[PDB]
Symmetry: D2
Subunit: 257 residues, 4 copies
């Protein structure tokens, strides 16, 4: 086996801008020679994403809208991906949401709607996407999601997000039990803190300063490092790996002390 | 210190019948000298809980309805508890639910509706009950909930229930981090399978039991008494150094599996 | 059903002084009515424990020397336990810059004293624990490696001895007394931990209240295990 | 970056025959353009390692003796690696051992010797070799060791205990060495049955190629954000009951 992804069609859901971790993954998958399929939420993000495919070397790229809440316009999105490429070999799911006033101080500032909300977007969406994409993954494939250490441990201010990530963390395991027999693998990457759109939602430079000082590899993670890990996960090089969670975070996971 | 729960009021949510784990927690806590405040899920259970509580040695037990899917009923229920006993010293969270056709076959038999229902009843309800109960919890406190190995590993057919349990597992940690400053500890018991109402709907059960009688280290299945008695510890001050923890009360099965 | 340790004989290994966690454990178990059997390593401690046994309500404690490093001595210590009481219901095992400051022999030695020793003492206690029993062990660098070895063995021990109604578990106690300050600021419960707290947890693990629990690790640390 | 191991010198230890996981691993690092330094314990393997080492093209490989007990000849070994190649970029540690009568029946079948022996060979040897290799590891690096599910909970006995020691020595080695830009990670392999084949997510068993491919990743710059990690190469067996 080798590492390349040529002839592999991968949807990368969740790019917002040049800082999106999805975007760093997009880049690494493209370098490996995959054909990317971006999906975005709304229509305000329409130009920014087209503007990013454009800047990618080869052509390839398709660009569909997909709000992950809403089964209706999820099917639309994948009926369309099938029209335009047919067999899908992979999905990078990099989509989470929480109310930002629930991510301050106490976990307890959350509430029924906010809680269900975080779980719907951050956790359920993966299952939803997988249900859609499944009929089209007929040559087997690989599914990757992004998680944070806060799913495992208590990270100041991650609060309800941490709970939903724990929910996602677990769904990864189950999805993997269901889909291994169709030779589809499901794993997560657990990225270290990196500056993104969604990253503004408390005391951030605090965390980034601590890591370079406290994490084994005295530095911060990048979207590149993550994308490179993603690239391996989407490649057959990782064919033996399913239901795993890989900390791409300078080893910060081993220091809690 | 000591084992006695004399002078403590503990709210046990989730009694349904004599087989329920909450009922095992009930006895144990009552016999350690606690005053139990029960909650049933709507009027179907009203008569059955009154009859169960009536069997206890002392006759101080309180009995209130509380349907955890609804902020208003929750505070209503808790507003009453406050009037009656003034201070609450613990909660036994024993509430779960998910759609039964979701817990057969592939995890993928779930859907947006059921997933969130399962998370709402099974995971959110804890946070819910704590928000409401927090103002009454003024002399320390112990909150205990019930999870299962399915929230750690893939268990055949546990499926979306296990994912909700994982959400629960995490909330236990975040709640504990929020509430240790007010001297309230939050923990879970991870129970081995026991035959209860809710067990039905978890298909091929006496197969799973028999397995645990052979494979389990302690070579025997769990009892609600075992669980109840670990809850007793947890509610008591003997356990005052423990919070955010998860105790497997499961005859050691968790190790023979992993 | 009861928290009492009436008529339980518990060996408590690893008492050095009034500060020992082992000692907190001793107090709490004595308090629950257990009869304590203390072991010492080297005759400097013989007097330290002998002293401490005397602070205990009842003069029912037995004092024996046991160097966990040497099998023959361990076989002797327990033969003598059996002679005096015949049967034992529990063991409390409280014996233990860069990580790269370790070396073959010190590495083995940590593992010998800190890991293997639970297995060694359990092999000896085995044929005398016929009334069922509970075994509890206490858990930085090469020590952390040895502790990890100890943790894994708890599970292997548990899986083997369950058929004999013998439970094996561990307690992880947070720092007890400068690193302290931040814990009292960063700990869920906002305080270091105490040896009473550990002890009352060991009492639970030694009684029937905990009969369904085997192969587990209990964090007595004011919640610090859940924080980053 | 790139998946190429070109111009990296990686020590591979514990090759013994064409089945050896370390061989599966040798092959994969070789394919990616690494220069392999093989080590062997005593004459039995001397032959096999040489005979096997031959198999490969681009044959720039190195062959030397190294008993992982015996601090001196570990020193002897790496002193020589230094002479012949200057700088080391990785170790593939694939050594494990415990008496077989002890990996049968109860865990309590073990004794003081087999216990310590198992820890020596299976856990300490990683520290021994990282210590001896460290000085010559002056261009960043990657250390990768071989574990299994028995260190995580019950499956295997005293070897599971040893692997737990191993697993903890990894996190520690990682924390010490990140500063010098050296990564330390473990692969936990599936069995290399009838059980795994029908109850593992990917409905199949593990191949040494799957293990080698994962290694190539961790030795390469693709995995540069990862340290103190334990990857399960096991058709998802770790997630099951
Ligand atoms: N940034 C970090 O340090 C870090 C660490 C660990 C995990 N993560 C995870 O990485 C993932 C990507 O976020 P990011 O950090 O790159 O920030 P980002 O804001 O750049 O990306 C988040 C994406 O989620 C999308 N999204 C929100 N609601 C959506 C909806 N309903 N339908 C479709 N898309 C929706 C946004 O459009 C955006 O594309 C998230 O799941 C996040 O939790 C980030
Ligand atoms: N029996 C087992 O094998 C086992 C094992 C591990 C964990 N558990 C857990 O124990 C807990 C209790 O379940 P059980 O097994 O004792 O079964 P049970 O059916 O006896 O109790 C479940 C209870 O939740 C209550 N409930 C459901 N929806 C509610 C809502 N709308 N509002 C308020 N209450 C509601 C039900 O009335 C019922 O009393 C659950 O969390 C379950 O997951 C059970
Ligand atoms: O998961 C994350 C983890 C970190 Cl450290 C930083 C940013 C993250 O991503 C988010 C944070 C908050 C919200 Cl509301 C949405 C998203 Cl996508
Ligand atoms: O969580 C559980 C685990 C086990 Cl082994 C047995 C029963 C359980 O409890 C439930 C199972 C299914 C549903 Cl719908 C509701 C509940 Cl309360």
């Amino acid at each position: 086996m080798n590492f390349s992804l040529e002839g592999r069609n991968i949807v990368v859901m969740g790019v917002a801008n040049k800082r999106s971790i999805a975007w760093g993954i997009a880049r690494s998958l493209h370098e490996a020679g995959a054909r990317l399929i971006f999906t975005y939420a709304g229509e305000r993000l329409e130009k920014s994403v087209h503007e990013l495919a454009g800047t990618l070397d080869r052509n390839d790229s398709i660009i569909l809208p997909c709000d992950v809440t809403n089964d209706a316009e999820i099917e639309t999105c994948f009926a369309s991906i099938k029209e335009q490429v047919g067999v899908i070999h992979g999905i990078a799911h990099c989509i989470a949401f929480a109310n930002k006033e629930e991510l301050v101080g106490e976990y307890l500032n959350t509430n029924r709607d906010g809680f269900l909300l975080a779980h719907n977007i951050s956790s359920y969406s993966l299952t939803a996407v997988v249900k859609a994409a499944r009929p089209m993954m007929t040559e087997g494939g690989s599914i990757v999601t992004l998680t944070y250490l806060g799913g495992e441990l208590v990270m100041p201010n991650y609060n309800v997000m941490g709970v939903a990530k724990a929910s996602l963390d677990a769904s990864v395991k189950y999805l993997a039990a269901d889909l291994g027999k169709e030779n589809i693998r499901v794993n997560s990457i657990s990225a270290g803190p990196i500056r993104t759109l969604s990253a503004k939602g408390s005391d951030f430079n605090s965390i980034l300063k601590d890591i370079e000082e406290r994490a084994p590899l005295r530095r911060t993670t990048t979207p590149e490092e993550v994308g490179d890990t993603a690239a391996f996960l989407f490649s057959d090089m990782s064919r033996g790996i399913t239901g795993e969670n890989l900390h791409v975070d300078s080893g910060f996971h081993i220091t809690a002390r």
